[PDB]
Curated annotation (Swiss-Prot):
This is Cyclin-dependent kinase 4 inhibitor C. GO terms for cellular component: cytoplasm; cytosol; nucleus. Changing residue 68 to P: In breast cancer; loss of CDK6 interaction. One of its GO terms (molecular function) is cyclin-dependent protein serine/threonine kinase inhibitor activity. Interacts strongly with CDK6, weakly with CDK4. Inhibits cell growth and proliferation with a correlated dependence on endogenous retinoblastoma protein RB. Keywords: ANK repeat, Cell cycle, Repeat. Heterodimer of p18 with CDK6. Gene3D superfamilies: Ankyrin repeat-containing domain. Belongs to the CDKN2 cyclin-dependent kinase inhibitor family. GO terms for biological process: negative regulation of cell growth; negative regulation of cell population proliferation; negative regulation of stem cell proliferation; oligodendrocyte differentiation; regulation of G1/S transition of mitotic cell cycle; stem cell proliferation. The gene is CDKN2C. It comes from Homo sapiens. InterPro entries: Ank_Repeat/CDKN_Inhibitor, Ankyrin_rpt, Ankyrin_rpt-contain_sf.
Length: 156
């Protein structure tokens, strides 16, 4: 039921997902376009991620662009899902094809709370330079995220 599972997750339909999880399904089964339910999950539904991770969903999977779900969470400012990902051993220092950590993405987009949690409560490598030589703080400054910059240098 890989397709149905992925579909329910993508739609943020917890009810449908949970009923579908009553079957003997492989939560890591790819859908119509090679993506797992966790990968296409509609962010802002941390319980959907939890239920999937609980059943053994692999959080570190990457798409063609080398993007993992935690990358999307951090980039769009969805803290709860990002934390859920971490409580289930997701690699916080996973890099996309450009060498960016979730920290770079959260910093670049100005998501202060996410950056705060990553810098103070995770193993995020704050000094990690991407392939172009930029650290998360560098990108924050480049994009004018002055509050993120202050926060990062404050404690780091």
């Amino acid at each position: 039921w890989g397709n149905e599972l992925a579909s329910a997750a993508a739609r943020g339909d917890l009810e449908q997902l949970t009923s579908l999880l009553q079957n003997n399904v492989n939560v890591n089964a790819q859908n119509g376009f090679g993506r797992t339910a966790l990968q296409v999950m509609k962010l802002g539904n941390p319980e959907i991620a939890r239920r999937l991770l609980l059943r053994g969903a692999n959080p570190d999977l990457k798409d063609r662009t080398g993007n993992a779900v935690i990358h999307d969470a951090a980039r769009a400012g969805f803290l709860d899902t990002l934390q859920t990902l971490l409580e289930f051993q997701a690699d916080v220092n996973i890099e996309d094809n450009e060498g960016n950590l979730p920290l770079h993405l959260a910093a670049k987009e100005g998501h202060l709370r996410v950056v705060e949690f990553l810098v103070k409560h995770t193993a995020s490598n704050v000094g990690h330079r991407n392939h172009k030589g930029d650290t998360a703080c560098d990108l924050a400054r480049l994009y004018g995220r002055n509050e993120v910059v202050s926060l990062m240098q404050a404690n780091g």
